[PDB]
Structure 1
């Protein structure tokens, strides 16, 4: 009695496992893209789906509200404080003299296009304070995996180094792909790197035995605050682009209370402390984040009547709506049209 929206064959597989062990309590709806899930839950042929901030924003505009959210810290959940996932931070080289004010024309390092930390928040922020939607021409050059092969945002990207170069590919083949990759891009070619708060740490002091990251220390980097002031890598709390919320399960409002109880029921058997976690573990997928982030310990209940605006938080909400004002998706446009806004 809960059609879950699975995206891709891998999630579908896991969703089938879940459907089986839950004794049909959970059914599965497979789609190609995550955005496809929003429509299917609207048409009632899907009940729930875990989304990231950007999609949550879209879902909300379409009238779908967050009902439960993942917690990545302690296994044990519902005690009223919306957990934070991480902080989106802009990093720069210590020995450089660049900052948020003279950022135009510099070289950037993004985790990948469409990503929350490396793209949505930064470009979302630049559009808000600048009014531009010309992201590809803001920076002189830069590496943003997933960008058009021949565009400034690909010039800084390296490839795999192998035969088929694969420059700018949104995959591990691209050296500058992901968080660790964006940092490396800053260390080797870029001016600024848009990653998360824990990135610099995870790759300094020798944690990363790689060559480019063997003699790197935290002091080699600084955070660029939106003031124009720079901060110590450890002060991300006082100098972050935005606080990113955890992924939220979104559903049609009238099925809100219904879905919670059924998911709680599911946690009780397949959660981290599931009575049956031995058969199937909801939050387990071999670090592949199938259905839920494997970093999930439990689902926290989002207060009833909580809209997407409240859940995302003003700052994040502002940057998302900001970014989306620039070439919005068909769904977002369709939903905004359907209403008054």
Structure 2
């Protein structure tokens, strides 16, 4: 029965926290309030293990994620939208009724701001007006940001502004408080009273500030659209300045995350917007004193939604907003390589192509999706199942591979590229598709379309069980939990760390040819590509385990039993699948797609420097690309991931999402609405 040390920054907030403490003492977990001066003091308290959680604004949730605080957003607020209650709000600009000045005429006016560092009050409006050339701030060599704002505006009320005095001229109160972040004219509703009393011509607030402050006088104010029109206050869909992320509940990244959210689940369920108590956790909104509103939680919010455990401050705000805040403070492809083997092939690509391709080594393929969403890496090549999880993350494929003919990728008006998913067993083994429940299994990795998605999607259609370690006896699927039966048959890397059941090239049973090595050594069935039997047999694989392997040592498994020869994969397979793809962010789609063709013309199967380096040769290990790849054909512009896979493959990958979503899929499903 522990307690959560909450930290509040204002005295009115301390009274609401203490009234929250008296109502939660009966519960199993409880609360303790820590009075502090500013938000920077509460962040130093949580990193010092003195406090636990604060509801910060997006511009301040950026500040918590920096070292050494390294705090993490664990809960977000939910605002009301008529499309659906998502976790974002709009930044608008409110002016008086019937006045003449447009958005270009804001030079020399008087403004009211929410606070120095807030999203809707400072980052968005100043970010826009400096991007539109109105404010003059080439960089930090000019000086502070607010020195340019004091030169731009005549006078204003910026709570928390220290160096400049024009930003404190319009604030109400005695000198000691007028500038502080808890002044009367601070916050979303406090800056609106700067407008209503006449200290400013424009107030930079969120979209629903006018509705809760002046409910019946809504027509006495106008929103300042970026074209120059004074649209009314109910037109923020057409007049917003940006759409910014919600206010986030930051905390440490430790065991204390789980007991905080269970407390927030307890308090919201009893003190939400539909509660019957006199106490409300959110508001309730209405005409009140400006310092009495927005205490510990904004009055516009209606619920709290949990942030997934993989998010941080960078991936919460999005790329376009984090790049804006990073700007005010202060031809080459960045490939993502997984493991030591792909990194040792990629540095070879870097030196033969002279620096135009550079790469960062990671440990798993889900790290490539995050470093590309962060923009720290450019491109990566993913299997068909990982294209779906990168497509829901916001990335799009731009190029794909051909296996059938090098000539066909020229005439792009042709059949779509594809391969096949088969099940390979040993010769004299009597195992077929029916009695597969008691047998062992060998996959290529969990989540990939060849070994995991097609076979488990057939099984999930067969038995309807979302348990998939249970359906087999044991096996080796790289990336599955180490303490489960789908990791015991994994041989591991054999190095200093056992590295058992890891989803990189260190594992001996990882990959297309790796799952075949699991079949011959210790296994009963291998779920792999249609041609991996052909590539390894015939004396081509110089590995000791495959020294004398031949094509007749294996027999494919049809769906209706019916063990058939490996050369007839057109008839005896599980499902047709799309090929691998290179997924990237939509912004940099045009830059690499013509650049990757310049790399392929030098290093392809008809490349000029294939004596120097071959892009599509990997010594039967599939390093950065498969070895069946002949040429890369460009995917047309605007092709989304739902169009690239096709509705045939999109049906099974959508249904298999419901059983066990991964952590990389869970945070991206949070990012794109629900």
Bucket of the pairwise TM-score, normalised by the shorter protein: 0.7 to 0.9
Counterpart of 1:154 (choices 473, 487, 491) is 487
Distance, in Å, in 1 between the alignment partners of 2:586 and 2:653 is 22
Q: Secondary structure at the match of 1:138?
A: coil
CA contact (8 A) 1:100 1:227 kept: yes
Deviations 1:308-330 (A, max 9, x none): 23323334333333444332222
State the 1:296 CA deviation.
3.0
Deviations 1:255-308 (A, max 9, x none): 223321111122233333334445544334555544333443321111222222
Distance, in Å, in 2 between the alignment partners of 1:226 and 1:193 is 14
Distance, in Å, in 2 between the alignment partners of 1:204 and 1:279 is 27
Distance, in Å, in 2 between the alignment partners of 1:25 and 1:187 is 41
Distance, in Å, in 1 between the alignment partners of 2:583 and 2:470 is 35
Change (3 A) 1:132 1:207: same
CA contact (8 A) 1:145 1:169 kept: yes
Q: Secondary structure at the match of 1:325?
A: coil
Distance, in Å, in 1 between the alignment partners of 2:547 and 2:595 is 48
Distance, in Å, in 2 between the alignment partners of 1:161 and 1:331 is 28
CA contact (8 A) 2:363 2:504 kept: no
State the 1:64 CA deviation.
1.0
- Of structures 1 and 2, the larger Rg is shown by 2
Distance, in Å, in 1 between the alignment partners of 2:464 and 2:558 is 19
Q: Which moved more, 1:142-151 or 1:262-271?
A: 142-151
Distance, in Å, in 1 between the alignment partners of 2:559 and 2:475 is 20
Deviations 1:221-279 (A, max 9, x none): 65444456665544432332223433211111232233211111222333333344455
State the 1:122 CA deviation.
1.3
Q: Which moved more, 1:202-211 or 1:267-276?
A: 202-211
Deviations 1:161-201 (A, max 9, x none): 99999997889999977667766876798664433334566
Asked which structure has the greater RCO (Cα within 8 Å, sep 6+), the reply is: 1
Distance, in Å, in 2 between the alignment partners of 1:161 and 1:27 is 29
Q: Secondary structure at the match of 1:180?
A: helix
Structure 2 segments unaligned to the other structure (5+ residues): 1-331
Change (3 A) 1:194 1:294: closer
Distance, in Å, in 1 between the alignment partners of 2:562 and 2:435 is 11
Distance, in Å, in 1 between the alignment partners of 2:377 and 2:570 is 38
The count of residues paired between Structure 1 and Structure 2 equals 341
Change (3 A) 1:155 1:217: same
| TM-score normalised by length of structure 2 | 0.42
CA contact (8 A) 2:420 2:577 kept: yes
Counterpart of 2:383 (choices 45, 52, 57) is 52
Q: Secondary structure at the match of 1:184?
A: helix
Change (3 A) 1:237 1:280: closer
Distance, in Å, in 1 between the alignment partners of 2:503 and 2:664 is 24
Change (3 A) 1:9 1:140: closer
Q: Secondary structure at the match of 2:421?
A: strand
Q: Which moved more, 1:147-156 or 1:67-76?
A: 147-156
| TM-score normalised by length of structure 1 | 0.74
Change (3 A) 1:35 1:233: same
Counterpart of 2:367 (choices 32, 36, 39) is 36
Change (3 A) 1:54 1:234: same
Distance, in Å, in 2 between the alignment partners of 1:257 and 1:70 is 18
Change (3 A) 1:298 1:164: closer
Q: Which moved more, 1:27-36 or 1:106-115?
A: 106-115
CA contact (8 A) 2:445 2:477 kept: yes
Distance, in Å, in 2 between the alignment partners of 1:129 and 1:19 is 47
State the 1:129 CA deviation.
3.6
Q: Secondary structure at the match of 1:313?
A: helix
Q: Which moved more, 1:304-313 or 1:208-217?
A: 208-217
Change (3 A) 1:172 1:266: closer
Distance, in Å, in 1 between the alignment partners of 2:490 and 2:514 is 10
CA contact (8 A) 2:364 2:504 kept: no
What is the RMSD computed on CA atoms of the aligned residues? 4.5
Change (3 A) 1:315 1:25: same
CA contact (8 A) 2:401 2:417 kept: no
Deviations 1:119-150 (A, max 9, x none): 33212331244332211111244555666666
Distance, in Å, in 1 between the alignment partners of 2:354 and 2:540 is 44
Structure 1 segments unaligned to the other structure (5+ residues): none
Deviations 1:49-71 (A, max 9, x none): 11112221111111211111122
CA contact (8 A) 1:83 1:246 kept: no
Distance, in Å, in 1 between the alignment partners of 2:348 and 2:493 is 35
Change (3 A) 1:339 1:94: same
CA contact (8 A) 1:78 1:301 kept: no
CA contact (8 A) 1:63 1:252 kept: yes
